[PDB]
Amino acid sequence: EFSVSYDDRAIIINGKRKILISGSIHYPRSTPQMWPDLIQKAKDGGLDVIETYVFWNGHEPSPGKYNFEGRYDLVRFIKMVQRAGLYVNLRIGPYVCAEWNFGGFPVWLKYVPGMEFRTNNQPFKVAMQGFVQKIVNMMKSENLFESQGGPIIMAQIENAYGPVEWEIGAPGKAYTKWAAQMAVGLKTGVPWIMCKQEDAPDPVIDTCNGFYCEGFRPNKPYKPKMWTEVWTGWYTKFGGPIPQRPAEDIAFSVARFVQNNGSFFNYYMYHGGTNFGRTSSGLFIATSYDYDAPLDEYGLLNEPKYGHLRDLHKAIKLSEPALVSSYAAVTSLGSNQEAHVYRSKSGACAAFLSNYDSRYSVKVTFQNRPYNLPPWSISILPDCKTAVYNTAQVNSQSSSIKMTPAGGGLSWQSYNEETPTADDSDTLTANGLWEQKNVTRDSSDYLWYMTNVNIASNEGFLKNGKDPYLTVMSAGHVLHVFVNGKLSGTVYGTLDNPKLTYSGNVKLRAGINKISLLSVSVGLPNVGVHYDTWNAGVLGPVTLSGLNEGSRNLAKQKWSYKVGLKGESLSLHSLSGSSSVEWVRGSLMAQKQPLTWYKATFNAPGGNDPLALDMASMGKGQIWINGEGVGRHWPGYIAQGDCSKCSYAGTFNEKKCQTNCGQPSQRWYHVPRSWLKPSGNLLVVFEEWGGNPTGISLVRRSRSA
Numbered sequence: 001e002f003s004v005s006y007d008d009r010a011i012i013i014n015g016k017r018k019i020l021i022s023g024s025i026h027y028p029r030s031t032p033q034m035w036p037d038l039i040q041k042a043k044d045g046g047l048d049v050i051e052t053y054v055f056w057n058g059h060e061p062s063p064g065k066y067n068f069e070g071r072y073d074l075v076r077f078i079k080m081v082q083r084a085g086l087y088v089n090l091r092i093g094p095y096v097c098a099e100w101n102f103g104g105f106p107v108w109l110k111y112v113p114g115m116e117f118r119t120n121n122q123p124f125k126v127a128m129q130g131f132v133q134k135i136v137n138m139m140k141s142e143n144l145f146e147s148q149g150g151p152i153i154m155a156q157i158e159n160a161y162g163p164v165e166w167e168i169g170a171p172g173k174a175y176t177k178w179a180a181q182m183a184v185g186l187k188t189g190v191p192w193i194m195c196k197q198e199d200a201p202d203p204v205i206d207t208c209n210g211f212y213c214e215g216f217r218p219n220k221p222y223k224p225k226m227w228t229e230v231w232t233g234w235y236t237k238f239g240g241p242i243p244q245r246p247a248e249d250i251a252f253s254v255a256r257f258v259q260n261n262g263s264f265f266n267y268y269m270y271h272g273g274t275n276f277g278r279t280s281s282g283l284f285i286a287t288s289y290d291y292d293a294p295l296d297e298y299g300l301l302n303e304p305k306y307g308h309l310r311d312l313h314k315a316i317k318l319s320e321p322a323l324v325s326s327y328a329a330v331t332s333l334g335s336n337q338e339a340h341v342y343r344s345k346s347g348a349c350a351a352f353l354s355n356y357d358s359r360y361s362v363k364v365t366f367q368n369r370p371y372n373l374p375p376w377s378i379s380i381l382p383d384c385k386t387a388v389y390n391t392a393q394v395n396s397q398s399s400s401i402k403m404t405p406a407g408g409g410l411s412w413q414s415y416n417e418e419t420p421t422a423d424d425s426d427t428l429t430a431n432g433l434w435e436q437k438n439v440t441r442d443s444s445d446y447l448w449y450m451t452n453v454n455i456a457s458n459e460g461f462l463k464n465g466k467d468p469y470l471t472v473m474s475a476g477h478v479l480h481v482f483v484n485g486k487l488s489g490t491v492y493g494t495l496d497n498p499k500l501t502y503s504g505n506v507k508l509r510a511g512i513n514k515i516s517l518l519s520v521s522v523g524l525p526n527v528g529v530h531y532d533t534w535n536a537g538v539l540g541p542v543t544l545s546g547l548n549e550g551s552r553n554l555a556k557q558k559w560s561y562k563v564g565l566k567g568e569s570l571s572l573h574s575l576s577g578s579s580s581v582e583w584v585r586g587s588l589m590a591q592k593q594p595l596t597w598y599k600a601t602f603n604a605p606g607g608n609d610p611l612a613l614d615m616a617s618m619g620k621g622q623i624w625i626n627g628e629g630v631g632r633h634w635p636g637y638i639a640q641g642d643c644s645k646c647s648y649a650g651t652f653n654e655k656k657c658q659t660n661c662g663q664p665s666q667r668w669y670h671v672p673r674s675w676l677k678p679s680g681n682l683l684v685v686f687e688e689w690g691g692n693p694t695g696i697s698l699v700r701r702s703r704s705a
């Protein structure tokens with residue numbers, strides 16, 4: 001009655017094989033209020049399944065203390081998908097990558113005794129078996145696995161370990177074995193998948209991720225061919241362009257897979273959404289996870305991509321009865337043109353006509369009728385006769401993004417952040433420099449490195465008007481340099497190379513000089529071999545040239561630390577906290593001023609358009625609406641990179657259809673309709689870089705052809 005098994009062909013849901021069209025919708029990147037409309041948009045788009053990760057570090061802020069409220073009501077989210085007649089692929093992880101802060105591991109886990117991440121390690125295995133079992137027991141509890149009549153038809157253990165395992169060697173393989181056996185062991189009564197495991201143990205199905213994976217094949221023949229991440233674009237990194245992937249090529253990629261015994265494919269992403277707060281953003285990942293997905297960050301339809309995939313699904317579902325009762329058989333149709341024919345003993349016939357030439361439309365002869373195949377396309381013939389769909393012919397009207405203000409420029413108040421300096425009574429100190437994750441435990445992006453640089457009165461630069469050289473080398477990711485109160489320097493990294501060096505002459509004078517270094521993180525690293533062990537914050541070396549001695553090693557003094565900002569320790573983002581300091585009303589409003597808090601109240605704009613914040617006036621920091629973390633703003637970083645005009649045809653890569661070069665890397669910042677009330681809306685912004693808060697205006701998203 002209720003069963004999920006599999007064969008060499010496809011997934012068997014209820015004794016019936018199925019070709020499963022699926023979409024990734026990460027729950028914590030939406031509001032619970034948006035969930036059902038997004039899920040409905042998915043249903044209308046031709047999706048059978050909704051895929052998501054579980055967010056380990058969202059769910060356990062500290063050991064044993066869990067959070068499944070609001071955006072993290074996972075059981076609610078799965079139930080809502082079930083409510084929509086769609087299935088669920090639950091990729092538990094707990095490592096999930098997903099451009100998510102620290103890959104999803106809680107930071108506290110890093111510091112458990114004897115701990116190592118993703119390897120045959122006792123502390124790690126225990127904590128991981130722990131979380132995976134808690135989630136599965138929560139899922140089992142309300143019969144949410146399909147064997148019990150629920151939506152979950154599949155689960156994922158780890159995420160993309162194959163590459164990491166190929167480098168760690170024997171521990172890695174001894175952990176891949178372990179992870180598979182001690183997840184299957186939870187007896188969920190539905191299959192377990194692993195993506196990028198050329199070596200996944202029976203009975204775990206290895207899947208792939210990529211732009212194209214028509215070449216792929218499971219690690220044993222009685223496993224079906226499964227595509228867990230059809231990338232629908234790419235992530236937007238801070239100071240990067242907005243990566244698009246064209247819909248004629250996504251169609252083309254999916255059809256290339258399904259024509260070749262493809263049975264499960266999942267768009268990553270279907271809905272991208274927002275990295276809300278300082279707990280979401282992976283390293284350098286911008287607040288927008290829009291991902292050029294078929295639903296944009298704001299849940300509106302990305303046309304014609306949405307419409308064009310909707311039609312492809314329809315064309316697949318007309319083909320499905322053939323697809324499930326035969327196998328993909330091939331027949332050359334010319335130099336670079338092919339035919340994949342699903343012909344059932346009963347009489348069903350589905351035919352995929354392919355044309356792999358990236359330049360020239362080609363006409364082929366199939367079963368006596370002519371067919372014109374536009375270049376880099378496939379024509380779907382669900383009857384083997386009428387081409388009802390072609391992955392180049394786009395029959396959905398486009399829709400372009402328009403942001404149009406409403407609410408009017410608000411009246412602002414300011415508050416300035418203390419620029420702290422060393423004090424002979426600081427408690428948190430050491431000789432030499434400490435790593436940032438170690439000190440902050442990721443309670444805040446901000447860490448103050450402070451020390452005393454004494455300068456003897458007989459110095460060369462105290463004779464000739466001249467400044468000593470300051471050189472600071474920090475693991476990342478932003479660094480502000482403060483001398484005796486005033487700001488001497490500001491340097492920042494990219495995703496690829498987050499390490500930085502500040503070099504510059506610095507006005508010191510005889511006696512004790514104050515050095516205060518503000519190192520900031522932009523989320524934690526989320527991917528790579530041993531990514532967890534990477535450093536952040538100032539580890540040096542730190543020198544001061546132009547002295548008599550010659551060049552002073554400042555890394556070998558007493559340094560003192562202070563975690564995070566005062567405004568944070570006050571929580572000036574919440575209504576209670578924001579009424580506790582003297583705000584600077586009137587016209588003295590700090591303009592183009594570093595380390596400044598801002599504050600305005602406004603009324604919900606008109607009706608039912610999605611909203612955002614224009615902040616191209618500002619530099620960098622965080623936004624909060626009504627005490628909830630909107631996310632990080634960083635319009636000060638200008639999109640670096642190639643932005644050639646783009647053709648659908650030919651092999652794709654992230655870099656192909658890059659957009660928005662020269663502009664702020666994210667101008668607009670998403671604000672849920674569900675986070676506003678009619679009036680009394682407390683906007684609070686921390687500006688870390690300097691900007692003019694008068695230019696902050698609310699906007700409405702809408703689209704037209």
Ligand SMILES: *[C@@H]1O[C@H](CO)[C@@H](O[C@@H]2O[C@H](CO)[C@@H](O)[C@H](O)[C@H]2NC(C)=O)[C@H](O)[C@H]1NC(C)=O
Nearest residue numbers: 008009221259260261262326327328329330340
């Ligand atoms: C789809 O799957 C079928 C089944 O695996 C593939 O056809 C097989 O081809 C191999 C040799 O290449 C034979 O050993 C199998 O017995 C074949 N099965 C059948 C039913 O013919 C087929 O190649 C796959 N499709 C594509 C496009 O590769």
Ligand SMILES: OC[C@H]1O[C@@H](O[C@@H]2[C@@H](O)[C@H](O)O[C@H](CO)[C@@H]2O)[C@H](O)[C@@H](O)[C@H]1O
Nearest residue numbers: 096097098099159160163196209235527
């Ligand atoms: O949206 C990005 C996507 O990355 C996937 O991971 C990929 C790896 O499987 C592959 O080996 O390298 C890619 C970069 O070249 C990338 O790291 C994740 O599976 C997925 O969660 C998501 O982060």
Ligand SMILES: *[C@@H]1O[C@H](CO)[C@@H](O)[C@H](O)[C@H]1NC(C)=O
Nearest residue numbers: 428430433434435436438439
């Ligand atoms: C981490 O911090 C602890 C306690 O605050 C300290 O004992 C240790 O030296 C630090 N280690 C680092 C930065 O590697």
